[PDB]
Amino acid sequence: CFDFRAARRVPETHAWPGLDDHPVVDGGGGGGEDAVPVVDVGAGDAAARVARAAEQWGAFLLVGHGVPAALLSRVEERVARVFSLPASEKMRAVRGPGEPCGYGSPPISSFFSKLMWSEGYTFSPSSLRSELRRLWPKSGDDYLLFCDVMEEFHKEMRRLADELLRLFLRALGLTGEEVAGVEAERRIGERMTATVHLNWYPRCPEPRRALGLIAHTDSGFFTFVLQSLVPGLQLFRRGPDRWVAVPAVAGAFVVNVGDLFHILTNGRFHSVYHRAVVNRDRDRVSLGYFLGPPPDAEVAPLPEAVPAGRSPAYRAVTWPEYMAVRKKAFATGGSALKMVSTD
Ligand SMILES: C=C1C[C@]23C[C@H]1CC[C@H]2[C@@]12CCC[C@@](C)(C(=O)O1)[C@H]2[C@@H]3C(=O)O
Ligand SMILES: O=C(O)CCC(=O)C(=O)O
């Protein structure tokens, strides 16, 4: 389709009016009130740092996670490789209307009239080998290397995801022994599912006009973002309204808290609104690794998160139910969280 590589300007179909409505501030370590929080997952005070970041930002940089740097670099190379394929091959794996996986813009794109300056690809790690055969129907080197790197990455990330979930629950102020009780009763970590979305943001000749990824919250529990060392992720903060530019830090993931975790925590942990901007000089690739419940599980505020005497702030919803609420929210200009809230 549209050739991002050849465009010498951004055409009106790809031009967004609002983009500088709010100021952008630096979120590096010298950024003050707006330095993005960093959490070292192996530090003894990780739970406390996760608490503060989840409450005040809904996001944090994550270091010390143990995922080998050599593996992360191979992941980024494979991801770049998918998007350097010819258009004709990519379209062989197109994600058709309403389909969950394949090559194409993510589902938020269909709700907006202007088009994003990026490409995407969604797959589920649990059926990676079969899904990726749509892209490489005769298998071969690129296919086998891609599946090998993504399989190993999924094994490391699913473990990290279980470690982070335990930290998030501790960060509600529960002891390790109480968290074990929650996990034993609800099996949240045992049951959560992972989905991957790959993003390619090509260089853009008029960055003030184009938008890499439409501003949104993630719908699920929480997401790990792995990105090339080119900046572009921005996190919205209020009072006053502003975008915080997340720094590109070697060996960090960014964790974003999503809507269903806002529900799970009775509103305690913020679901972060975020977007990705393009840039003039460098392409960059990112991968989101999205955690959420299985399709049959109801998500409602945890009793341990609801203060004593108080009522739950949100109704119970399954993820498929909540996706329908999101779709309605996108069309009507509303907020899916408000729509399932008890007020
Ligand atoms: C598991 C997921 C999570 C999805 C839906 C599905 C696959 C792709 C994910 C994203 C990725 C990009 C933006 C978002 C808002 C989108 O449009 O697609 C995300 C969405 C969500 O957070 O709900
Ligand atoms: O590309 C980024 O840094 C944003 C990733 C993200 O927001 C997503 O893919 O949902």
Numbering used by the authors: 12 to 354
What does the paper say about this structure?
GAs are synthesized in a stepwise manner by multiple oxidases, and the conversion from direct precursors to bioactive GAs is mediated by GA 3-oxidases (GA3oxs). GA3ox and GA2ox, members of the 2-oxoglutarate (2OG)- and Fe (II)-dependent dioxygenase (2ODD) family, catalyze the oxidation of substrate GAs using 2OG and molecular oxygen as co-substrates and ferrous Fe(II) cofactors. Here, we report the functional and evolutionary analyses of rice gibberellin 3-oxidase 1 (OsGA3ox1), a gibberellin synthetic enzyme specifically expressed in the late developmental stages of anthers.
To understand why OsGA3ox1 produced higher levels of GA7 compared to OsGA3ox2, we performed X-ray crystallography analyses of these enzymes. As a result, we succeeded in obtaining the structure of the OsGA3ox2 complex with (co-) substrates; GA9 and 2-oxoglutarate (2OG) at 1.9 Å resolution. The carboxyl group of GA9 established interaction with S230, G231, F233, T234, and R337 directly or indirectly through water, and its γ-lactone ring established interaction with the main chain of I119. These amino acids are conserved between OsGA3ox1 and OsGA3ox2, but not between OsGA2oxs, OsGA20oxs, or even AtGA3oxs, with the exception that I119 is replaced with Y in OsGA3ox1. Moreover, upon comparing the structure of OsGA3ox2 with that of OsGA2ox3, we found that the GAs were inverted in the substrate-binding pocket. Taken together, these results indicate that the substitution of a highly conserved Y with F in OsGA3ox1 contributes to the hyperproductivity of GA7. Whereas the main product of OsGA3ox2 was GA4 (OsGA3ox2), we found a remarkable peak of GA7 as well as GA4 when we analyzed OsGA3ox1 (OsGA3ox1).
